[PDB]
């Protein structure tokens, strides 16, 4: 999930604070690729 990816421990700082992955990035389920916009009657669409 996005949350488990969010709390990936990148770095434990000098004072002891944790650098989590959600502290350097937005995390969301998206497409593998964004080069194609597909619209059926002006609405978002996928198909076969």
Residues that bind another protein (CB under 8 A): 3, 6-7, 18, 20, 22, 33-42, 45, 47
CA–CA distance, 7 with 23 (Å, rounded to integer): 9
- Residue 20: exposure state from Cβ atoms within 10 A (0-12, 13-18, ≥19): middle
CB of 10 to another protein, least distance (A): 13
CB of 48 to another protein, least distance (A): 12
Q: For residues 14 and 38, which CB has a smaller minimum distance to another protein in the complex?
A: 38
- Total residues found in the chain within this entry: 48
Q: For residues 14 and 46, which CB has a smaller minimum distance to another protein in the complex?
A: 46
Write the DSSP symbol of residue 44.
E
């Amino acid at each position: 999930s996005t949350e488990e990816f969010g709390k990936i421990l990148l770095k434990v700082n000098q004072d002891g604070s944790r650098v989590l992955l959600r502290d350097v990035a937005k995390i969301e389920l998206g497409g593998e690729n964004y080069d194609i916009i597909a619209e059926f009657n002006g609405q978002p669409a996928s198909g076969l």
